[PDB]
Ligand binder design. Structure first.
Ligand SMILES: Nc1ncnc2c1ncn2[C@@H]1O[C@H](CSCC[C@H](N)C(=O)O)[C@@H](O)[C@H]1O
Ligand SMILES: [Cl-]
Ligand code: NA
Lengths: 265, 265
């Protein structure tokens, strides 16, 4: 009679919370989805081993179109868990899933876990200074989306940082790298010329947040556009004007050039 | 020979991640602070049993003035852990402590945990739509902080949601309730008269996120300003322009007035 939305955290099988693991262990059925994000530091096998349960993976279609036929029926007479990378309900469409549960007469509870939205605090950039967030998508066919550029512009105009998620083809396991993101933004800048993203723009790259050895790098596009940030997933941040403490952290912890202490503060 | 910043999560001792527990278990010395937030579902004793270690609690002064004198010295010859509610770097000034660590020749690692910043997802409001965040501070003496009012105004004009962290006076054991925040906001509205926060403003209240039964309520200030949302901690959110699905969730789960479903495109 209960459905548990349980977050798996950021990187590996150990990013689940103690509460989340213990609850997952007591559930009769365990479902999971890895299309919104992928746990780059672990495997389904390792997660299953830790929880000690067989995990049925669901595709985007399974969830978006048939959640009420796959998951909810079982939650009517059993305890069921729905595992998702990060924190549950962060993915835009997941919250609506609780409405579906309600209508099916199923009680639902949310067990939180670390999300990239809060993990970015490791970059030293103040969380309150982040503005609207966006996703950088690959153009294709006659479609060249550029709204993420406008997001950066509006946030930066207000001295706010912009968190940019990069395109992911979960099924095909194809990750957009920070490098590709920068190349795309430079291309959008060449088209809109708003002076929003140029070779002189200061950016921050965070790779493998959650890992004990994440890659946190800060610098100008002209210098980082070809740097090796390691394996995905990658997150790109275009900070607004910096508080001196943010700048000092980027220099001391993220190897940013001393130059940002006078140019971007 | 190392310092770990480990988050404990939102509500109780089980909100810590598995990674964080296993590491905190092997540390020689464990310090902690509980002045940046409130974990309403646990106690120092319960946390100590889980970790199986004695924990030295530090005050804001111990940390801000003597972190390098109390904690770092030990990290040079031992594996030390510094615990904090939620995520250690979110809406705190702890990130700067990593710099002190570097200066002291101590390598540091960050172990994330559920944060109120991403837990807002449980309100049904799309997390990417939140803009600049702010804190509602208790006026002191003739000093009456009002900048948080302008943050709401700025976000609202852009159609973005505004997250409002509420004040805390840990030593005095004072925790600002959503009710007190609303009263302060109405007073600022009276002074500034920007039509930003009135009795007809729609707001969302989230209390004790992380618990299995948090209070999630949405409605007009006139109706919620005197409502009992339960024990602290509380967070206040002033939504911007709502998507239909956000409104649906607020009505179905947060008990919001059905009239909001009728969004004004
Ligand atoms: N479980 C919880 N429920 C509701 N609000 C919470 C909360 N935990 C923290 N807050 C809110 O955030 C404020 C602390 S700000 C520090 C936040 C912390 N580093 C984190 O990652 O969550 C509190 O005063 C309160 O307004
Ligand atoms: Cl293996
Ligand atoms: Na945000």
């Amino acid at each position: 009679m209960v459905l548990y939305f349980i977050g798996l955290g950021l990187y590996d099988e150990r990013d689940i919370t103690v509460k989340g693991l213990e609850i997952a262990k007591k559930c009769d059925y365990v479902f999971a989805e890895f299309y919104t994000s992928l746990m780059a530091g672990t495997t389904l096998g390792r997660i299953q081993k830790l929880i000690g349960k067989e995990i049925r993976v669901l595709s985007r279609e399974d969830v978006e179109r048939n959640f009420e036929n796959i998951v909810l029926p079982l939650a009517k007479e059993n305890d069921v868990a729905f595992l998702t990378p990060g924190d549950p309900l962060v993915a835009t469409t997941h919250a609506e899933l609780r409405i579906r549960a309600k209508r099916a007469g199923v009680e639902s509870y949310v067990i939180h876990a670390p999300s990239i939205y809060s993990a970015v605090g490791i970059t030293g950039l103040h969380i309150y200074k982040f503005g609207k967030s966006a996703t950088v998508a690959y153009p294709e066919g006659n479609w060249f989306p550029t709204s993420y550029y406008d997001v950066i512009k509006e946030n930066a105009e207000r001295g706010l940082h912009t968190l940019l998620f990069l395109d992911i083809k979960a099924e095909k396991r194809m990750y957009m790298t920070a490098n590709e993101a920068m190349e795309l933004l430079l291309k959008v800048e060449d088209m809109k010329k708003g002076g929003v993203f140029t070779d002189d723009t200061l950016v921050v790259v965070l790779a493998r947040a959650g890992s004990l050895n994440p890659t946190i790098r800060a610098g100008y596009v002209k210098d980082l556009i070809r740097e090796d940030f390691g394996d995905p997933p990658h997150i790109l941040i275009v900070p607004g004007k910096l508080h001196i403490v943010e700048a000092e952290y980027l220099v001391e912890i993220a190897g940013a050039p001393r130059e940002i202490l006078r140019v971007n503060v």
